[PDB]
Amino acid sequence: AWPEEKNYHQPAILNSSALRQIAEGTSISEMWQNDLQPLLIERYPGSPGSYAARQHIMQRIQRLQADWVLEIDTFLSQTPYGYRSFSNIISTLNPTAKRHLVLACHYDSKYFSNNRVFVGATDSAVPCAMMLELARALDKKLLSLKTVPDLSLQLIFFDGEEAFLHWSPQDSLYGSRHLAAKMASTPHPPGARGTSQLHGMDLLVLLDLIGAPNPTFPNFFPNSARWFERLQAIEHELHELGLLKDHSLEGRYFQNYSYGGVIQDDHIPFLRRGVPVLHLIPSPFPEVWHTMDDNEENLDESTIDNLNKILQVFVLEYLHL
């Protein structure tokens, strides 16, 4: 019956002084320097930067005081170039806990051929950095979960999202196609009474392509609608208290409108197995998407900080903290 708790979970909404605490307790300056800048490198799967990217992540996660259980999931899969290795990163609190909220990003960049290298600033680098910051910021509040609903937080940094040659069902989402199936096969909790690690997913909040100025995120899925509306309410109630920077209520990030087609992303292998997905990707896509102009100079430090704040409150509301 606990697989069905996700369908009924309710937030605990923070008060205005608490929102005043979380907006000061995070800072895009530290995020920029300590978490985001080292991943502004060439890091395709099986590359030198891929390892450096991965060890950046885990190191920062072990700087923290909350006892994150790190897991590297290395595996082989065929690509248009023969058999490659991919290693998803998975950071977990309360691995023994039955239900997990999952904030997800992919940390690989896409292999490209003038005098400029593709670092995918928005294509993963900022969203993966935003996941690092939130953990550093909420550390003192996550440390409360160490001492003991049965719900905690999980960070996933997928590998091999990108097409190697030409984007197709077969040449895409390597890291998440494997990790969904692996999760559909891993007995969770250690009791192993007919439940999977996929069943222990409450909600997959997949960040992607976030750093650009003026993003509008559509509401993709009915079954995550209410959490999209909590994102609206969180953005409203941060602005109304004057906690958002260069933010206007007429050009907001989270607008109600629906999306008709489907976008293929790391959520797709889990959506196909009945995981409630909250896909935080903007439509339209950033104009820099998949061009080497995708870089730090075309990022909006103030937009990212507003979204840092909005997301950090969502999971502090989701987790009843």
Ligand SMILES: COc1cc(N(CC2CCCC2)C(=O)NCCCn2cncc2C)ccc1OCCN1CCOCC1
């Ligand atoms: C919404 O928008 C775009 C979506 C897509 N579909 C949809 C299908 C593609 C063909 C049929 C429908 C998509 O599955 N995509 C997967 C890429 C995923 N992926 C790569 N890295 C990070 C991620 C999440 C295709 C193109 C879209 O538009 C791009 C136009 N932009 C170009 C430059 O910037 C401004 C406009």
Ligand SMILES: [Zn+2]
């Ligand atoms: Zn991409």
